[PDB]
Amino acid sequence: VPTGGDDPTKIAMLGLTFDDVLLLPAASDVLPANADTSSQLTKKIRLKVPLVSSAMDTVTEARMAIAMARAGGMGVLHRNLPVAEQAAQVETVKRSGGLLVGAAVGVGDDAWERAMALRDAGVDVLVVDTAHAHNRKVLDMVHRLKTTVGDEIEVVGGNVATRAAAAALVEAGADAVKVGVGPGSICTTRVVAGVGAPQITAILEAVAACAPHGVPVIADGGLQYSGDIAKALAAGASTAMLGSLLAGTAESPGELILVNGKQFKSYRGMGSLGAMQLVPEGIEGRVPFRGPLSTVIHQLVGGLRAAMGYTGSATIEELQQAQFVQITAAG
Amino acid sequence: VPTGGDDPTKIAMLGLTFDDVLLLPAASDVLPANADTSSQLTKKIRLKVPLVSSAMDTVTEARMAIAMARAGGMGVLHRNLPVAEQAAQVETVKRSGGLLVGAAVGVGDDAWERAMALRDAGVDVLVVDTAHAHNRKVLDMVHRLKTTVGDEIEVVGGNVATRAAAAALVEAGADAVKVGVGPGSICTTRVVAGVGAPQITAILEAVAACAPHGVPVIADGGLQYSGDIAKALAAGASTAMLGSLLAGTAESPGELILVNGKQFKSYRGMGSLGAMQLVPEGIEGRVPFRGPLSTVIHQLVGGLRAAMGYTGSATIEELQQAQFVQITAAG
Amino acid sequence: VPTGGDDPTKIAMLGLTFDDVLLLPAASDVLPANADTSSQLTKKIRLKVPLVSSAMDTVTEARMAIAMARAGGMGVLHRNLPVAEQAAQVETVKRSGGLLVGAAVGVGDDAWERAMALRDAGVDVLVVDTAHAHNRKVLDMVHRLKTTVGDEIEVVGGNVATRAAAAALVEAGADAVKVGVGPGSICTTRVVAGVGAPQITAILEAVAACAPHGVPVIADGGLQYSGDIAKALAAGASTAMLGSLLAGTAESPGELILVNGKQFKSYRGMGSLGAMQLVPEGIEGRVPFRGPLSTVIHQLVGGLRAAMGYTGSATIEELQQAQFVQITAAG
Amino acid sequence: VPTGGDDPTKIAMLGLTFDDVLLLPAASDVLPANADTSSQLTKKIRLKVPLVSSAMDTVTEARMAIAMARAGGMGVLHRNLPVAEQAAQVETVKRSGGLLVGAAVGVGDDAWERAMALRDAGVDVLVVDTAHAHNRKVLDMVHRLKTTVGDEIEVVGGNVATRAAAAALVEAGADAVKVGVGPGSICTTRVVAGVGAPQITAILEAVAACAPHGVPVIADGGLQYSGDIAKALAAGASTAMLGSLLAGTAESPGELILVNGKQFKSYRGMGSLGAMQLVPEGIEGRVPFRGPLSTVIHQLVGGLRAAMGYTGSATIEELQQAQFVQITAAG
Numbered sequence A, B, C, D: 001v002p003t004g005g006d007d008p009t010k011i012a013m014l015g016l017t018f019d020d021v022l023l024l025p026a027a028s029d030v031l032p033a034n035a036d037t038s039s040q041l042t043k044k045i046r047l048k049v050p051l052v053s054s055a056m057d058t059v060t061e062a063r064m065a066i067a068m069a070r071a072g073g074m075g076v077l078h079r080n081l082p083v084a085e086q087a088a089q090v091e092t093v094k095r096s097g098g099l100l101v102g103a104a105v106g107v108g109d110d111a112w113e114r115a116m117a118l119r120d121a122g123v124d125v126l127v128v129d130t131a132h133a134h135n136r137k138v139l140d141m142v143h144r145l146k147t148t149v150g151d152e153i154e155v156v157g158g159n160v161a162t163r164a165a166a167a168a169l170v171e172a173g174a175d176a177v178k179v180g181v182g183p184g185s186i187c188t189t190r191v192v193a194g195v196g197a198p199q200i201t202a203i204l205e206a207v208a209a210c211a212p213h214g215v216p217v218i219a220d221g222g223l224q225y226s227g228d229i230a231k232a233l234a235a236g237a238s239t240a241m242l243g244s245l246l247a248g249t250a251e252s253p254g255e256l257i258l259v260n261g262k263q264f265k266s267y268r269g270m271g272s273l274g275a276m277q278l279v280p281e282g283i284e285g286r287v288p289f290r291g292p293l294s295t296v297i298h299q300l301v302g303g304l305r306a307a308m309g310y311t312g313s314a315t316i317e318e319l320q321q322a323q324f325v326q327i328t329a330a331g
Ligand SMILES: O=C(CC1CCCCC1)N1CCN(S(=O)(=O)c2cccc3cnccc23)CC1
Pocket: A129, A130, A131, A132, A159, A180, A181, A182, A183, A187, A189, A269, A270, A271, A272, A281, A282, C032, C305, C306, C307, C308, C309, C310
């Protein structure tokens, strides 16, 4: 074995991230403006824009979830707050129209209580929200929810980085599988635990387990440019979840920060010290202020539409069949 | 599949760019000074120097096209201006001798009108000028032009990044195929759309579709050093189109810019905000002032001649048969 | 042969270091807090925490060895000092409880005398401490020690970077094999001698020779983050030896250094000029002051526990069966 | 073909440079101090230290050639000066003992005259000194010299980067083949001409053509550290030629230069503008002042000896049979 030892499976794969690949152009009759950007968030819920905001306390509360839904995506309300408060934000979103809204729960003891409270508040999607879904407690959580409230509510499970983990969530009854163990911009899991999986390879693997069962994959974390959205979907994902790309917007929680005459907002991991207030697996940082959400979403979607133009993808379903070229460091 | 999923074609290729390879020396009786640098721009038109200036409003207007033609290459007049103006520049070039000149057209409604006007002005080459030629509207444009004015005018089509796209343009009747989707120094297509193809691999693929039909390939974008010109031609291209390398010259449009006591000129993408005055796919930048075109061209050609010396290529046709060594990051 | 010459064995392997790989998540019922971090330092000695401090004069004297043992690891007393002094430090450690302690010896003439003196002082582990164990003098040293004092004392041999070297130490009677030729943070062997072996590949190879004989492998050098500890153990190592990660602690030898208002301590190679007071193979540097050892060890172990959680490893023995994904430069 | 086109030979090889590889340790009974560093410079001439100084006007004139010979290596007198002057330097070296000395000639018209003049002055080695030896004029030069003065003088030919070029020089009668097209620290051939070959791969290939005929290979250019010397010899080279590593010494031509309170000397390519006083293929730069040659040579040789210790090479001939591990960017 060229890299050492006698076991060829020790190093199971070569993991590619977004910067490792480019989308290849293909024959096209598709104009960017006419492309259809709608896509399955879950088995039942289709979004007009395949974008979801992260369940983070510096990204999504009621104001973001409302702006996302109006932009044609959805927001996932974070769970770093009292159950009553989170449910009140759900109500607030519903009060503002017939707007889609999701909300994160854990798998702890009050997790079940929290989910029932969100159900009562009218939530559309429950996201069982962990760093590692391949675990009997998370799988049991997903399943219990699905059997109890599954007719009225769609249940998302995550996160996973492998085929077998995605397969287990499908089996457990997930309406969507969320992919991303370690790729987040504010993530330190890779240096703290030494654990991770580059996101393009992780998506390809999850989609191999999920697509045969008609279960959409949400690509979560590591997206830096609108181009990475196209890449993630082309790898087979149905939507993308964004943290950093949306944390700089007016609608995100938090105040402006002035540093050297430039405008920023705080953006922090939910495994950061501050968020947990111990071995943190996220940092607390800043992102540039980017203005209104509507305008950020317009830009990102514009980039996607261009990609659909280049690749001849009339729909997201077609983009999922596009091909990549692997590039080198020099590229 | 080592990089994920079960489909070996998902990641179709490993894309190499200019920095990925070096030309290997070979047995040589060729002195740089005696090497023959002439090459086909199109099926009928041979240039003394295998270089063409980009169709950009910070690179080529009449003064550049005249200087290029006199240097033994050619200029392609940009189309970001009224038809009457562009045609007047064509006339201006023709007024200055029996000088070759090309001009860009689009595929829009006024595209056809523009081309007829250029024809009337005496243009030698029409370049159908898009970011993605593999499209029925571009292919139909190339063909219509070829059937209508093809006996007096050579028609170039572009840009493509794949074998099938190049094949389609040949079929459509192109007299030359221009290669380059995303490699430009001022390009942001790769981060905005996630789309692209490293240029050495793109040239190899285009040449595989074009050379059997006797159609020359123009390598367009990403050339940073005179060495990249030799590399591009060795990959099988017949000419190279230059933007950044020529934008700093006296003959390019625009005034000098003084920054920190150094001289620059603006150089901007035709998909930049400023050029389009929306989702831009180019930036607006600066390049160092490099002085007279004649001297820049002398240097670039000098580098090519040295390459032809090292590789024993008496002619460009021979250089196209040279071999590469792939290098690593460390090199 | 694609990289040159006709001999496929000239370039024997592709060497991976810690940054080349990530641990893949796997099915897990393991909570970080409940994971069992105990591991074999040698055939007979099991540690509560799989960590050993380096035998360096800026890392381990009596105060460090005591703090390490109390934290559940062990310290290896450096040998850059008179025999009487080193033995007095051994006694000092033993005076402070029933604390495990190891001590380095060379293979010179006074080496044997030194080892007997340490034995008399009550040492638990003798580490035969060289940069290259695959040598008749080192092998004979290990063996002589083992046959003479082997019933009361465990004998460690090192360092090696290949399978055959590890095999020779096992044969010689080593109770543990220490791996690391050139990976140290303060090492210059790779630029001075051009010699080395990336540590993940080196561990895989050593473990292939050592594990079938029940001999534990100590991963020595190159560990920068708590994640590298998990990686090293997953590659098959049983413990890790730390220099740089511990040199900044209160318990290490040396005073604080203030530089630009920040706190540091000196950390230097035992092959550095200063340490030898000639062709040095280490540098003299600084590391940031990190406070009490107990707290540094808590953090590192916390990172390991998280890894064991992600990978479903209940014990270190299970973690040694985990799988990696190879990543690219972009990751 | 994964990198493009249909021709698998288009990209002939994967080229490795010194930083791509490390020497693997092996079983050893060799102490650095007792290792035998002697090696063939040519078929007849053996050196005590396998090092030769470059034929450059900022590296070797009489004072350097004398210091090199005394250190047990040799210097090659540059040819950027009148024949009478170069021959007078040869005499000067001979006047200072029974000291080996070499001298560069070209292949021009006065080349032959120059060589006869050096012969008369008592030169021991003529180095036919080009950037590309695979050329009938260079091959004829080597051969003519060999047939005319070959019994008293050893003739070196260079430079080559391929197996076929090395084979042609052997056939032509070369007593040694010098390898290095483009790797020099002051070289711009790779960006100007796009031509080159990474040096480890180039050595492996040259040695494949030269060693079966008993012809020594001189590794010329790209050596940055004493470790690269060991690497070059392990790849099969018999000596190494150094420019940058020696240009900072007291014995090199040129005065001290003070810049920001630090000491430097000028070091410039013989294809630089200044050296030629046009398309330059070298730059004019600075290197740090390093003091006496004797001390620099001691250090470099010290590094080699350490390598011979690690690899168990008693002699240079044994070191040439050592093995490499390929490393990644991360290493
Ligand atoms: O409880 C733990 C530690 C255990 C988790 C699973 C078993 C192993 C240890 N954590 C809590 C949550 N996360 S996180 O906030 O950083 C996180 C949030 C969502 C998506 C993640 C994707 N990859 C990394 C971290 C992520 C950190 C770790």
